[PDB]
Symmetry: T
């Protein structure tokens, strides 16, 4: 059945490509946060284990919402290790850093998602896709708040 | 008591006129979805009876939110068969279609409401009314997601 | 598949006709109550906004129950503005009356539904349809309690 | 202690006998529904596994209510395979039918309980046992609604 | 405002008089049950303290439903010691009986409410007051189930 | 089994006598508040119906707590119309006053219970019954708060 | 689709045969417990009514778990009176025993289910089926705990 | 740790200064609303006591959300009487007005917060701070809806 | 950090010593109650198993509240078998009494805690430690109520 | 309507003056706690952000309870920045202290509220106002518990 | 601090290595299931969207449980795309298969996890690690049940 | 009534002796954890107070489960200070250690319970008691997980 939501095929494709980068960043941050939840040690273990648990639980919902916006636009949502490694701007950590370095990496991760979201608004200006713009705004709000709570631990 | 929310009376009347069409479309789609919920038959009965129930339940809240935004702008909210029949662009179904035609009609219904919402943004861009713009964006998000789920059944 | 519930087809059709009138009245009262919920003003705004919310919330469930009893009897449930205007004995209000007149109209609405319910019982005795008779009885109970609560506001 | 509820011992015994048949039918349908819940296969597995779960869960409560009405009338409630096999009008299925045949058998099962309930009303009329009449009416309502939901899957 | 629910003023007044006796009996049983809840002793203390608690909790809701049916019929609901002592057929217990006598009096109390309820049906036959008839039937169901549970303790 | 809670039998008997009057006053107020809940009319029906429901719901718990304190002191708790009519200082209303007069009466009821509670404190001075003193204090707190909310309606 | 869970088809059939006897025993105990719940009398009625309710509620869930393990092994789950009478080792009670005898029979029933579970482990040691062994262990744990609670009543 | 969220330091400082004013105005309206909740009297006491409770409860959450957006921007959130008095544009009420004047003041307060929110948008346009824009929009929607509910009481 | 709560160090030390005896008694009663919960047998098993469960569950919270009041006064809370055995006035039961003797011992236990609480008030009066006096009062209320429920089982 | 709660007008005014100082201290501590919740940084951010949230959430309920006790005594509750700055003994912090200094200040704040409550008991002794004394006691309990938890963080 | 749980370090490392493969397989199945949840189309969309959501929700909890068992054994839990691609035996699907192929792949995935779990038991028989064996058994139970539900759709 | 669960009396006694030592160790660790919960201080207070609270809450359930397995085996569950001091291998802490030493002692306590559980398996290998083996396994799983969480704080 044809899709008639006021956005043309090539524009929906370009928006889906941007949201695919956002999905890949968000999913990579999800797994990194889950990883640090398991692997963090030292005197802040209790609070960081819990904090990273809240963060990855929220990111699991965000992954679903971003993916299903791609579906609403008429395209398949990427969902493999290869697709996400190709699209993600977040570099993974293959070892076990000190807790302060875990916090710093997760701050940079929040900012990377924000940076990807910001890269998409120019396209949305040209096209007028208010639902996707609101999604991006919600994600920016969450990552900017989380960035504050994480960097506050360092000071 | 004078209303002083930063929008003049005839500008508020114009936004309320557009929201009245959005309300009438939303309410007509609500009754149609409720109708199909009761009347659908065939092997997809259980899943469509449930899917349509979730949709009309969400629409009943949306009708209330759209109507109370009209009130916040200082105008009466329309609420009769005659008023909605006059304002609605949704085509009503007087008989009992087969399930796949019910699904098709509801997809077109979602897209019709999006179109009505999209028609109001030019006005908000002249007058500046960010709360209504957010309301319209939420309706477009819900209806575009619902159109994906519905049309996915026909693939 | 044949329907063997102990009521013949012609009697099931006659009961469904009566329930179609009850459904149309109930749905018309639902919309009128919802209308007054949005549009009432004056010193009793808070209490009537709330009271009318409770009533239309209940009536939305009642619509579903009546329509699904029609389905159980083997007939399509009506669900359009045209069908309900043809069948309803409640007169819609196209303006915005004063609060006391809103209350008075809703009292009369409760009593109109009771009247339609009473009209159906003679048919049910002849054919013994105990489930439909209990449904009618429940509606009369709800509308007669609601009539008391509304008319108490006038005194 | 004597039982003085406005119904003589012989009439209570006769009503208890009728309810024993209703209980046996309801319990046999309960087990058949539970059986089909485990054993159904094919593309409708997810919907029918869930639908039959809802139905057997409701029937388990109904068995308790019918049995406890027998106890309120002053007689023991039957509760063995031999007693239910002797009293039940529902034939059990010893194999694993196709899903559509499972649906058909459950429709007939609903109608068999309705038929048993109908057969008890004459006694209740001659004797004025309003609580039992209301129990029978509630069972007829549930089974007639369930029959509609089931046979709609076959259209 | 006029009351047009299909029952004449003289008949509504006679039904309200019957419900007043039922209200009085139910409230007197409520207090007696609450009394025994406090004052029962011996090895069955824990079970009877709890069982009587469940019973008086249910009766408090019943008194409200009975009183508000009187109000729906257009008459004030009685609510004083003097009014209830004049209308109640339940004899109060001024001392502290043994647990077994407490149980036996509560059985008789259930049966007294049933008896008062049965006395009202003839009036409802000539008049067609279905909601009141259903209320009476509900009370009869509850009191006959409670009578079975209480007298079972004595066996 | 002897009671050894640090209060001799004569003092326990005197405290119980005082609590017996507090119980009768609390229960009388409970029934009066319940009565006004049913019978109030006029433009304040909705808010007074609800307010009086909250009050009688709280009073029902208070009755149980006061009676059980009497039980803990070693004496039976009174629970009959004749006992409460004898022990109570609260005047019952046998008719249906106007709403403003219902409010006034309930204000005077709250203050009467406070007076009855106040009358018991001297017995506890002598004896050091700290649990009873806390129960009286809580009743005074509730009733003084309720008196403010009620009389605030009259200003 | 072919089943590849690491257990050959005839070995799965043998485990399913053992679980079918366990299912038949558990379901027979379920119906006996339900029967005694309705029919027990005497001074222990309240506590046994409740205790047996808790037991049959647990057993209803265990029946579903056992049946679905048979399904996971690739075989139909038996579910008729004839099948369960054939496969069960627990004998039903066709009359109404005294309460102490009901308790004794339920103790023996718990122990019968333990014995049936035990009888299956030799097969599992040969074949290796750790999920089934864990299910059997859970049923032994529940039935041994329940036997303690039941026989404690008789001491 | 550097803040890299796509908004330079001077722009973040300016937005935080604007939100500091929104925070002060929101907290001042919070305390005024809480004040009127305690201090309102007259026949609308119940409805206004409840209505103003809902409002100050929502405002307390809004205070936290606005302050934490300031934190996300990298600046301290003000939170003292001196700071809020200095930053607020709403004037406090030091006495106890009549209920209609309390309503009027709270309507004006809603509109004053809307004005403070409006004053911040010019700054976000230049900079593109989509999360803050959404926050201002949410506050405008809540205050404009609340203004409608309050001013409806005066009509 | 100095402690400045209006009570000098020596008086706080003396209050903490008294609360240490109350904590020891309460913890010893908690373990005894938990013991009898496991070990009681006979026809009251179900009721005493449940009643003792409610009691020990409440006592667990009380232990925490007493200990933390000691901490608030500035002293370590005792928490070992030797500390509690040294301070406790409750004598432990090393065997398995009959149920009636378990009930009697638990009555005496409630009274032992009350006795210990009464021994502390003189100190509190001389010093005005109102929070500790309220804690003692709440413990006395619970234990005197529990003593009533337990001894009522014996009568 | 006269206030007759057993405390004379001048004494109620004096008690209300003391509670006004308590309210002002509690509200000032509420805002200081809210402030530190937003502004704290360093490795203890997570634990202190959450601890201070729990504290200000509880203080918000306490401010309402203290204010409504003032109302129950017949006096208006103060509720402005100026009224609280005049009455409060807590000095506000206009900057952003180190986390350890925030904790120290919050300890001193709990003790300041305790000191204000203690200053009122002499008056209450002369007048006899048990509800107010119980409220002060509860505040002292909460603040002394909170002081222990806070000062424990320093050790 | 040394780990002394009764298993030597290289034996724990070997168990951790096996569980790392189980974790990688579970996580790969999790993402594949989430992918298919987003991307499935056709008439089974509604039921497969729901079924796959329930599955990936369960798998997300299982990932955490398996990772935290690795942590309990004293080893870091892997958690990157590169590690999971290296350790997994399940192949991802890079395209969008038809619904029946999605079902078949998820059946094969359940069976793949069972094989990986099964492959670890030989090590557990040499070393003895009953907690890990119970985790493996739980995963086998879940995946075998899920395989039945999935393959039933293809029958 | 004889116990027939497939284990001979002296074999059950031996299993119950082992579980009695596990119960004593679990209860000793419970009290030590509760003690440290009250008495810990320093910058980790908030996290350790909460962490130790979660642990002692879980242990309280474990104590009940272990004791009631002893009861299912037909033996009394020990429950006094003297019995637990005799049976326990965990030593109590009579003073107030620094937080890091509290953590270290609780790690050692978790490992002690694991050793006690492990010590019972040789017996169960001779006797066969799968329910007890599963209980031991669950305790080993919980204590090994808790040991990781605790020792992670010391890294
Ligand atoms: Fe965790
Ligand atoms: Fe989803
Ligand atoms: Fe938004
Ligand atoms: Fe204009
Ligand atoms: Fe439905
Ligand atoms: Fe609304
Ligand atoms: Fe939004
Ligand atoms: Fe939006
Ligand atoms: Fe609303
Ligand atoms: Fe429906
Ligand atoms: Fe009914
Ligand atoms: Fe009904
Ligand atoms: Fe299932
Ligand atoms: Fe039952
Ligand atoms: Fe029952
Ligand atoms: Fe009914
Ligand atoms: Fe009670
Ligand atoms: Fe009511
Ligand atoms: Fe009924
Ligand atoms: Fe009913
Ligand atoms: Fe009501
Ligand atoms: Fe009670
Ligand atoms: Fe108190
Ligand atoms: Fe208190
Ligand atoms: Fe084989
Ligand atoms: Fe199932
Ligand atoms: Fe297990
Ligand atoms: Fe096992
Ligand atoms: Fe309030
Ligand atoms: Fe916050
Ligand atoms: Fe928004
Ligand atoms: Fe605690
Ligand atoms: Fe926060
Ligand atoms: Fe309040
Ligand atoms: Fe208190
Ligand atoms: Fe090795
Ligand atoms: Fe979804
Ligand atoms: Fe975790
Ligand atoms: Fe296992
Ligand atoms: Fe397990
Ligand atoms: Fe397992
Ligand atoms: Fe042996
Ligand atoms: Fe605590
Ligand atoms: Fe237990
Ligand atoms: Fe238990
Ligand atoms: Fe296990
Ligand atoms: Fe195991």
């Amino acid at each position: 059945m044809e899709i008639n939501i006021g956005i043309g095929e090539q524009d929906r494709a370009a928006i889906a490509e941007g949201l695919s980068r956002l999905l890949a960043d968000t999913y990579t941050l999800y797994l990194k946060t889950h990883n640090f939840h398991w692997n963090v040690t030292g005197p802040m273990f209790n609070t960081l284990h819990l904090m990273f648990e809240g963060q990855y639980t929220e990111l699991a919902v965000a992954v679903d919402d971003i993916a299903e916006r791609i579906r609403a636009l008429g395209f398949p949502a990427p969902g493999t290790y290869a697709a996400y490694a190709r699209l993600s701007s977040i570099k993974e950590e293959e070892g076990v850093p000190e807790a302060e370095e875990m916090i710093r990496q997760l701050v940079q991760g929040q900012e990377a998602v924000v940076r990807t979201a910001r890269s998409i608004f120019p396209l949305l200006d040209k096209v007028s896709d208010e639902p996707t713009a609101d999604l991006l705004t919600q994600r920016m709000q969450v990552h900017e708040k989380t960035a504050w709570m994480l960097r506050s631990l360092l000071a």
